[PDB]
Amino acid sequence: DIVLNPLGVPSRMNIGQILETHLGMAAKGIGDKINAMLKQQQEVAKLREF
Amino acid sequence: TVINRDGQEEKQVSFNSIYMMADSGARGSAAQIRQLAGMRGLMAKPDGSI
Amino acid sequence: TXXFXSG
């Protein structure tokens, strides 16, 4: 969706946006994974997983 | 360390982004770089004493 | 710390 320049990071020294991004990557996946489970053969087993 | 044709290990400057930006003069200062890598340092008190 | 002994 967005392309941010990395040169804005090192001088400003605001690391958090990166971590937010990393976790945000992780989160982007897990919900998506859940979505897949939701798509087909949805069962409480998915709940076991969650 | 990167592999040389003969098979020997050569020592390159590295293309690490913090390092690359710093060395290129694109963005960053050594003092700032150490802020994410090396221990921060001493703070000033408000009186100016350390 | 950074700038101003802060940073």
Short mmCIF file of C-alpha atoms in Angstrom, two decimals:
data_model
loop_
_atom_site.label_atom_id
_atom_site.label_comp_id
_atom_site.label_asym_id
_atom_site.label_seq_id
_atom_site.Cartn_x
_atom_site.Cartn_y
_atom_site.Cartn_z
CA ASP A 1 0.00 0.00 0.00
CA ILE A 2 2.73 2.48 0.97
CA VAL A 3 6.40 2.95 0.13
CA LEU A 4 8.33 4.80 2.86
CA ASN A 5 11.94 5.89 2.41
CA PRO A 6 14.33 4.18 4.87
CA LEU A 7 16.52 7.30 4.98
CA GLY A 8 13.93 8.81 7.30
CA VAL A 9 14.79 6.25 9.97
CA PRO A 10 18.49 6.50 10.92
CA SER A 11 18.78 10.25 11.54
CA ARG A 12 15.45 10.51 13.35
CA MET A 13 16.22 7.49 15.54
CA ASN A 14 12.62 6.37 15.94
CA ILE A 15 13.06 2.59 15.95
CA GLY A 16 9.51 1.73 17.01
CA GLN A 17 7.94 2.18 13.57
CA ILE A 18 10.14 -0.67 12.40
CA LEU A 19 9.09 -2.95 15.24
CA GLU A 20 5.47 -1.96 14.64
CA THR A 21 6.10 -2.92 11.05
CA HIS A 22 7.66 -6.27 11.98
CA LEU A 23 4.90 -7.23 14.39
CA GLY A 24 2.53 -5.81 11.79
CA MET A 25 3.96 -8.22 9.26
CA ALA A 26 3.45 -11.06 11.74
CA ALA A 27 -0.09 -9.96 12.43
CA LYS A 28 -0.74 -9.58 8.71
CA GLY A 29 0.01 -13.26 8.38
CA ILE A 30 -1.81 -14.73 11.38
CA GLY A 31 -5.18 -13.19 10.66
CA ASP A 32 -4.70 -14.26 7.07
CA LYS A 33 -3.97 -17.77 8.27
CA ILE A 34 -7.14 -17.67 10.33
CA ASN A 35 -8.97 -16.44 7.24
CA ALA A 36 -7.83 -19.52 5.37
CA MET A 37 -9.08 -21.73 8.18
CA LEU A 38 -12.33 -19.78 8.07
CA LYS A 39 -12.56 -20.33 4.32
CA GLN A 40 -12.59 -24.13 4.38
CA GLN A 41 -13.51 -26.91 6.81
CA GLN A 42 -13.92 -24.51 9.72
CA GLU A 43 -13.87 -26.38 13.02
CA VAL A 44 -13.15 -25.82 16.72
CA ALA A 45 -9.74 -27.31 15.88
CA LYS A 46 -8.88 -23.87 14.55
CA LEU A 47 -9.92 -22.59 17.97
CA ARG A 48 -7.53 -25.10 19.53
CA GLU A 49 -4.89 -23.50 17.32
CA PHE A 50 -5.83 -19.92 18.25
CA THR B 1 33.49 -12.25 5.14
CA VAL B 2 32.71 -13.29 1.56
CA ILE B 3 34.14 -16.15 -0.50
CA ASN B 4 36.95 -15.37 -2.95
CA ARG B 5 37.25 -17.21 -6.27
CA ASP B 6 40.17 -19.34 -5.05
CA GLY B 7 38.09 -20.23 -2.00
CA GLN B 8 39.74 -17.85 0.46
CA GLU B 9 37.70 -15.63 2.77
CA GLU B 10 37.87 -11.96 1.75
CA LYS B 11 36.98 -9.03 4.01
CA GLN B 12 34.51 -6.53 2.55
CA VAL B 13 33.23 -3.22 3.95
CA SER B 14 29.67 -4.65 3.84
CA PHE B 15 26.43 -3.30 2.39
CA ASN B 16 24.55 -3.16 5.72
CA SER B 17 21.96 -0.41 5.48
CA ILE B 18 22.96 1.57 8.57
CA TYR B 19 26.61 1.15 7.56
CA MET B 20 25.95 1.80 3.86
CA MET B 21 23.95 4.97 4.57
CA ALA B 22 26.60 6.17 7.03
CA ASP B 23 29.60 5.48 4.77
CA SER B 24 27.90 6.92 1.70
CA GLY B 25 26.96 10.11 3.53
CA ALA B 26 23.37 9.44 2.54
CA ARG B 27 22.15 9.50 6.16
CA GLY B 28 23.53 9.02 9.64
CA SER B 29 26.35 9.72 12.06
CA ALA B 30 28.49 7.27 14.03
CA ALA B 31 27.08 8.64 17.27
CA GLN B 32 23.56 7.97 16.02
CA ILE B 33 24.43 4.53 14.68
CA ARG B 34 25.84 3.47 18.04
CA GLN B 35 22.47 4.44 19.53
CA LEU B 36 20.83 1.36 18.10
CA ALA B 37 23.87 -0.89 18.40
CA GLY B 38 26.15 0.18 21.25
CA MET B 39 25.19 1.16 24.79
CA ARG B 40 23.69 4.66 24.83
CA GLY B 41 25.81 6.60 27.29
CA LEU B 42 25.81 9.26 29.98
CA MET B 43 22.96 11.75 30.31
CA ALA B 44 23.26 15.33 31.54
CA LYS B 45 21.40 16.49 34.61
CA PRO B 46 19.37 19.70 34.27
CA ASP B 47 22.01 21.57 36.26
CA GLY B 48 24.46 20.39 33.57
CA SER B 49 26.30 17.94 35.82
CA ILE B 50 26.69 14.40 34.50
CA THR C 1 22.38 10.13 24.90
CA UNK C 2 22.48 12.27 21.80
CA UNK C 3 21.87 15.97 21.43
CA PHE C 4 22.16 18.03 24.51
CA UNK C 5 23.53 15.11 26.46
CA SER C 6 19.96 14.01 26.02
CA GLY C 7 18.14 12.50 22.11
#
